[PDB]
Structure formats: C-alpha cells, structure tokens
Amino acid sequence: QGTLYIVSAPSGAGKSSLIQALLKTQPLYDTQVSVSHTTRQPRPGEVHGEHYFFVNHDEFKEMISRDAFLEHAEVFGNYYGTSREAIEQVLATGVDVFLDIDWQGAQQIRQKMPHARSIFILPPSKIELDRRLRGRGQDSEEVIAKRMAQAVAEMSHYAEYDYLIVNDDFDTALTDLKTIIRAERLRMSRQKQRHDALISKLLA
Amino acid sequence: QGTLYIVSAPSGAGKSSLIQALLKTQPLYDTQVSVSHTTRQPRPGEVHGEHYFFVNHDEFKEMISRDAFLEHAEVFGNYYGTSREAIEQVLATGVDVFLDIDWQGAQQIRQKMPHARSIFILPPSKIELDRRLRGRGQDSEEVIAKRMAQAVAEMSHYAEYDYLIVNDDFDTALTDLKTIIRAERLRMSRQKQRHDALISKLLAD
C-alpha cells in the first residue's frame, strides 16, 4: 500500500531539513519517517518505537542472523539498522515511509525491496556545496577538505537512484520532493485503490 | 529525451481544457501537443503542420503500408493518425508531447511505444459527470443517455493507464497534471542528462 522512499545525499544538500520539512506538513496516516533499531542507550525523552527501537548488542546480532534488517551498519561502536518488519508493518497501513540512509544502506535496501523508490539530493554547485559544508565557518581547512571528499564519494553514487533533486533554493527543492510523492500517489495502482468506490459508482 | 504522454478520458472529465491550459503555461521547448495526420480537407484557419499534417488517401495508405503510425483510425471517409516520425522528432529534441486520444488509440500507441506514459482523467462522481455531459442543458434524455453510455465505455478502460487524475476542482486537476510532468522530469534518466555539467563539476577535483 504505502511506498518506501529511500532518501540519500552528501552532507551539504539540505537532505535532513527537507525531510523534516516534509513531516511538518503531512499527516502521520500519509507520511512517516523510518524508525531505526539501535544498540545505543536510550537518552532522556526518547521513546522505544518512536525515536528508535532500543535493543542490546546481542539482540541486534541475533536480528542480523535472522536477516531481520533491510540495512544495518556499525557506527562508533553501536549498530543502527532498519528493521524489515517495522518498515512493512507501516507500509501495509498505506503510509509512505522516508528512510534517510547513505548509499551503502540504500543499496542493501534496494536488494531486498525492489519496489522501494529512492531519491538523491544534490547541492547546486561546487561552491555552494563547499559553503554549506563549512557551516559556521569554524572548522579547519583540512577538516573541510575531508568533508568535501566524503561528499564527493557519496555523490558519486547518484545514478543508482530513481529521482534526483538539485537543492539550490530550499523551497523549490522541497516542492520537488512533494511533487515526487504526489505524482507517485497519482499512479494507477494507488489511485484505483484510493478511488475504488468512486470508480465503481462511475461505471455502474 | 522527451516523454510521450497519452491522455484519455470520457467527455465530462475536462480533458481538452486541461491539456490546453497546460500549453498556455509551458514553453514549446518543454511541452507540445502532437499534430495528427489526416486526409480530411483543411478547414477555415487550419494550417498544415499545426492543426494537422494534411495528406491525401494515397499518402496515408502508403504510410499505413509502412506502419508509420502509432495509431490511426478511419472515420467517415477519412483517415486520422499520429505519425511515429513526427512524434519521435519532437521527443528527440527533449520536448514532452501530449497526445489526446481515445482508449483504443491509446492501446495502439502503448504497444509501439512502451516508454510512453498514459494519464486517464475521471469526473468526480456520477452526478457531476451527468451534469457536465448535459452542458447548457438543451438536449434530450436520449442524447444524454447516449453520452453517458459512451462515457461509461471510455471509463471502463481506465485501469490500462499509468496515472489517474480525478478532475473534481479544475485547478487542482491541473496541478495534478503539472505534478506528473514535473515528477517525470525529476527521474534519474532525465535529470542525469539535464545536469550532466553540474554533476561533472560536483565530482571533479
């Protein structure tokens, strides 16, 4: 019923913000963000099943052994992963899910979910990507150069995705994202289900 | 480069006006309607290459022999069809082409143009379809029942299409159409070509 949207981009393409901006304007019965499993400890305020599903390292490795993840990775001595079951339960409710992930996990997901759509977001020029990576302007030139090399390595994978948004002006990019989602919702397999009663009435 | 959009709908779904409104706000280097070939005789105002590509029965038949049409029909002594050459020429210049056609012509085109996208447009309810078919309201219940039967026959094929727009509010339907065309242009196949130079500068150094 719902569509899984894999969203990736180098730092500096405004990806995280674009997704957050999307959730602020769509009801949870239409659009939700993926909730990942993690082995890190819950922090104050976090809720299991809401900010993350919190498991311990053995549970996570056990899950991995039963191939329970669409993707997982170890990051700073903690594992993070996207549970297949969790994603399917939400999609089965007709909700579209946005799964922000690097190109590696995006490749893992696509292998298990051929129907997942994926969107890559790019910065609009080398100069603007460099400006956005510099943020407040407080990092050393070498740290920035490593951020740029990392962004370039991420962007080299752009052709593996189904859609490309060049985020120059934020609101233009965000309209682009909403356009993708709206168009996918005008597709016949979703529309004939959504308008099932109406079509039956029109043809009777 | 460009995409062929097959657009169909029963009368009463605002299809022609939606397409027309589309052409009013997009440049010819982005969007055009297809120009059909026909043996009918040019009429007042019609210009070859614009309202139709006018040709005579022998040319049309020779084209049919060459399977040069994506679809064609023969009605009241005349041929009407969409030249495959004329469409691919425009598509090859990166332009999206809209082809307004009935469901039968739509099936003919799809088989020959698997990459074409089709959009079907529906009225928003039986009562509103009936209201729109009655128009100014100067027709017999017989003519209306016939319009409605014809609309029903057209709608029974809606599932053969890639997209469905339910045209309740006109402006909202027009935005739907524009959304489809913009989303298609965001696909990787077209974006990677459109931004080739940008992408190459981003990866450089």
CSV table of C-alpha atoms in Angstrom, one decimal, chain A residues 20-120:
chain,number,residue,atom,x,y,z
A,20,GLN,CA,11.8,17.3,8.4
A,21,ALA,CA,10.0,20.0,6.4
A,22,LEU,CA,8.0,17.2,4.7
A,23,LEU,CA,6.8,15.7,8.0
A,24,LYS,CA,5.6,19.0,9.3
A,25,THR,CA,3.1,19.2,6.6
A,26,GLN,CA,1.8,15.7,6.1
A,27,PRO,CA,-0.4,13.7,8.5
A,28,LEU,CA,1.1,10.6,10.0
A,29,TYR,CA,-1.5,8.5,8.2
A,30,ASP,CA,0.1,9.6,5.0
A,31,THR,CA,3.7,10.0,5.6
A,32,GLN,CA,6.1,8.7,8.4
A,33,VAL,CA,9.9,8.6,8.9
A,34,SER,CA,11.6,5.2,9.3
A,35,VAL,CA,12.3,4.3,13.0
A,36,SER,CA,15.7,2.5,13.2
A,37,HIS,CA,16.9,-0.1,15.7
A,38,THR,CA,19.9,0.9,17.6
A,39,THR,CA,22.1,-0.6,20.3
A,40,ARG,CA,23.0,2.7,21.9
A,41,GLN,CA,21.3,3.6,25.1
A,42,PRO,CA,18.0,5.5,25.1
A,43,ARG,CA,18.5,9.1,26.3
A,44,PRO,CA,16.1,11.2,28.3
A,45,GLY,CA,12.9,11.8,26.5
A,46,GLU,CA,13.4,9.1,23.9
A,47,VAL,CA,10.7,6.5,23.4
A,48,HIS,CA,11.2,3.0,22.2
A,49,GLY,CA,9.4,2.5,18.9
A,50,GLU,CA,9.3,6.3,18.4
A,51,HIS,CA,12.9,7.7,18.3
A,52,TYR,CA,14.5,4.3,17.8
A,53,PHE,CA,13.8,0.7,18.7
A,54,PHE,CA,16.3,0.2,21.5
A,55,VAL,CA,18.0,-3.2,21.6
A,56,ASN,CA,21.2,-4.5,23.1
A,57,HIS,CA,24.1,-5.8,21.1
A,58,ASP,CA,23.2,-9.5,21.2
A,59,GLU,CA,19.6,-8.9,20.2
A,60,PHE,CA,20.9,-6.8,17.3
A,61,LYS,CA,23.3,-9.5,16.2
A,62,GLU,CA,20.6,-12.1,16.7
A,63,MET,CA,18.4,-10.0,14.4
A,64,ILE,CA,21.1,-9.8,11.9
A,65,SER,CA,21.4,-13.6,12.0
A,66,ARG,CA,17.8,-14.0,11.0
A,67,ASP,CA,18.3,-11.3,8.3
A,68,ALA,CA,15.7,-9.1,10.1
A,69,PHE,CA,17.3,-5.9,8.7
A,70,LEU,CA,16.9,-4.1,5.3
A,71,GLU,CA,20.2,-2.5,6.1
A,72,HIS,CA,22.5,-2.1,9.2
A,73,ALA,CA,25.8,-0.7,9.9
A,74,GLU,CA,28.1,-0.2,12.9
A,75,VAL,CA,28.8,3.4,13.7
A,76,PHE,CA,31.1,4.5,16.6
A,77,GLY,CA,30.8,1.2,18.4
A,78,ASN,CA,27.0,0.9,18.1
A,79,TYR,CA,24.9,-0.8,15.5
A,80,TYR,CA,22.0,1.0,13.7
A,81,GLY,CA,19.7,-0.7,11.3
A,82,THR,CA,16.3,-0.6,9.6
A,83,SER,CA,14.0,-3.5,10.6
A,84,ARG,CA,12.2,-5.1,7.7
A,85,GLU,CA,9.3,-6.0,9.8
A,86,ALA,CA,8.9,-2.4,11.1
A,87,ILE,CA,9.0,-0.9,7.6
A,88,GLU,CA,6.5,-3.5,6.3
A,89,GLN,CA,4.0,-3.0,9.0
A,90,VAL,CA,3.9,0.7,8.3
A,91,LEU,CA,3.7,0.4,4.6
A,92,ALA,CA,0.9,-2.2,5.0
A,93,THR,CA,-1.1,0.6,6.6
A,94,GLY,CA,-0.9,2.6,3.4
A,95,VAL,CA,1.6,5.1,4.9
A,96,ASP,CA,4.6,6.3,2.8
A,97,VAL,CA,7.9,5.9,4.7
A,98,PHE,CA,11.0,8.1,4.3
A,99,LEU,CA,14.3,6.2,5.2
A,100,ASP,CA,17.2,8.7,5.3
A,101,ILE,CA,20.3,6.5,4.6
A,102,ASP,CA,23.7,6.5,2.9
A,103,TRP,CA,24.3,5.0,-0.4
A,104,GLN,CA,25.5,1.7,1.1
A,105,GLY,CA,22.4,1.0,3.1
A,106,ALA,CA,20.4,2.3,0.1
A,107,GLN,CA,22.0,-0.4,-2.0
A,108,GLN,CA,21.2,-3.0,0.7
A,109,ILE,CA,17.6,-1.9,0.9
A,110,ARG,CA,17.0,-2.0,-2.8
A,111,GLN,CA,18.2,-5.6,-3.0
A,112,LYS,CA,15.5,-6.6,-0.5
A,113,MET,CA,12.8,-4.1,-1.6
A,114,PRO,CA,12.8,-3.7,-5.4
A,115,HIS,CA,9.7,-1.7,-5.2
A,116,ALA,CA,11.4,0.9,-2.8
A,117,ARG,CA,11.7,4.3,-4.6
A,118,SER,CA,15.0,6.2,-4.0
A,119,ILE,CA,15.6,9.9,-4.2
A,120,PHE,CA,19.1,11.5,-4.3
